[PDB]
Amino acid sequence: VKPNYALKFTLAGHTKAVSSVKFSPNGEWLASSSADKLIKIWGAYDGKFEKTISGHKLGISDVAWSSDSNLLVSASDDKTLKIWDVSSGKCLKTLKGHSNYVFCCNFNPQSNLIVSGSFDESVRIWDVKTGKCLKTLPAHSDPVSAVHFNRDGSLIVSSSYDGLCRIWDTASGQCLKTLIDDDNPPVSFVKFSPNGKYILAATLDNTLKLWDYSKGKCLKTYTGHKNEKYCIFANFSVTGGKWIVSGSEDNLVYIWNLQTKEIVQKLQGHTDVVISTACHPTENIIASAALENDKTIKLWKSDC
Numbered sequence: 400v401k402p403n404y405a406l407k408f409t410l411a412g413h414t415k416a417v418s419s420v421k422f423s424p425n426g427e428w429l430a431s432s433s434a435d436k437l438i439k440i441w442g443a444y445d446g447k448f449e450k451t452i453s454g455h456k457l458g459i460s461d462v463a464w465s466s467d468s469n470l471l472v473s474a475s476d477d478k479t480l481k482i483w484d485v486s487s488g489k490c491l492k493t494l495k496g497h498s499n500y501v502f503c504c505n506f507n508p509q510s511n512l513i514v515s516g517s518f519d520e521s522v523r524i525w526d527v528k529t530g531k532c533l534k535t536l537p538a539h540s541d542p543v544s545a546v547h548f549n550r551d552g553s554l555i556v557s558s559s560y561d562g563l564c565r566i567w568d569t570a571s572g573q574c575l576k577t578l579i580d581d582d583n584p585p586v587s588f589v590k591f592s593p594n595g596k597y598i599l600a601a602t603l604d605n606t607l608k609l610w611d612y613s614k615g616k617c618l619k620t621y622t623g624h625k626n627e628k629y630c631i632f633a634n635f636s637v638t639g640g641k642w643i644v645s646g647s648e649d650n651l652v653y654i655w656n657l658q659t660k661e662i663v664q665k666l667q668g669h670t671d672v673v674i675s676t677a678c679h680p681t682e683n684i685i686a687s688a689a690l691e692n693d694k695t696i697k698l699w700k701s702d703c
């Protein structure tokens with residue numbers, strides 16, 4: 400048993416490296432961000448271009464959807480985040496406060512809050528309605544590589560190149576747990592598991608790990624790919640078989656069996672580092688995006 404992801408569409412149009420791709424929660428759309436300072440919206444099932452969203456004055460590292468699929472937030476080298484109305488393309492709010500590049504962002508499940516992480520080593524929590532910063536967390540001592548809310552929104556997980564993963568209480572801003580590795584490889588990505596009990600963490604020693612953050616115990620390790628430089632997204636695939644999905648610096652998409660940790664598929668098609676992957680919420684569809692020598696997004700579909 401293995402998935403059989405096959406290339407269905409190639410999505411071209413960005414003029415520089417693509418930095419992130421995300422499927423909307425309602426399954427209809429894909430959003431992409433790029434070093435060309437643009438956001439593009441595409442049909443999730445047919446890859447059809449829908450619109451370009453513009454406004455940032457430097458490149459964009461990350462984009463994220465609100466839970467009702469109506470808003471996007473983007474994180475830019477221009478030190479701001481921007482909240483967007485997707486249907487109109489209008490910038491609703493510009494979130495100012497970080498003192499250097501903003502690298503990562505996410506809405507909470509109710510989507511009344513935004514979390515961000517920056518080169519300035521802080522994590523900020525923002526009010527969507529007013530656009531104002533509610534909390535500044537002194538989260539790390541190196542740039543923040545990822546931020547993510549758990550399934551109910553009571554917790555935030557952050558990661559950094561200082562080598563730490565930290566769990567934060569959303570309401571109070573307190574640090575509830577710090578995950579430490581004696582070899583201390585830079586942590587380049589983290590996110591909560593679908594059931595909220597685990598975190599998946601990428602380190603720049605070509606390794607992904609599944610952690611029980613409450614116990615500080617590593618349950619699973621996934622290797623075989625290449626990741627020593629970039630902050631590459633990783634995913635849990637919940638629509639068919641239980642797979643882990645990640646990009647790689649050898650230009651492939653890697654898919655692992657969650658439980659056995661074996662590689663089950665490698666997706667060949669991109670011509671530069673696959674920096675970002677995303678999994679469709681209801682169908683067995685993967686989106687992948689690559690860096691400057693490629694500049695495209697690819698949609699892959701599987702029977703399981």
Ligand SMILES: N#CC1(c2ccc(O)c(NS(=O)(=O)c3cc(Br)ccc3O)c2)CCC1
Nearest residue numbers: 592593594595635636637641642643657658
């Ligand atoms: N091995 C393994 C374990 C496992 C097995 C089965 C699971 O469902 C989960 N929960 S999870 O990690 O949140 C999850 C991952 C994927 Br991919 C899909 C759905 C989903 O609930 C976790 C951890 C030790 C047993």
